[PDB]
């Protein structure tokens, strides 16, 4: 209610928030994976999967 931004920037901000909330403790989180050096399992997280639609589609691979 106390906001003036549009759904786009708000969606970006909420995606970042959700992606940060995975910064807690427990496996399946980014700290444990970093300790295990499983840099690959990060690509398959669900949060990046929810923020992906916001990416420029013509250059998302690069």
């Amino acid at each position: 209610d106390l906001a003036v931004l549009r759904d786009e920037k708000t969606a970006i901000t909420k995606g970042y928030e959700a992606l940060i909330k995975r910064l807690g403790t427990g496996d399946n989180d980014i700290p444990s994976l970093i300790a295990k050096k499983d840099y690959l399992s990060l690509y398959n997280l669900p949060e990046v999967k929810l923020m992906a639609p916001l990416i420029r589609p013509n250059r998302k691979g690069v």
Binding site: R56, P57, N58, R59
Partner: protein
């Protein structure tokens, strides 16, 4: 060169002639300015850009 005299092509002021005649073959220059773009109706809202950032543009933009 310029329209209303399209049958002429200046080269250091030297006017040259075209062996042909055209009234529309030249009128369509929407693709002779840039490579993968086309002119459109004027819109001030659109932001000014350079020739380099063009690579990171999308469609309908």
């Amino acid at each position: 060169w310029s329209k209303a005299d399209s049958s002429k092509i200046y080269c250091h002021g030297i006017a040259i002639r075209v062996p042909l005649v055209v009234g529309d073959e030249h009128m369509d220059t929407s693709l002779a300015l840039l490579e993968g773009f086309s002119v459109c109706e004027n819109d001030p809202r659109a932001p000014m850009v350079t020739r380099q950032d063009l690579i990171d543009v999308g469609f309908g933009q």
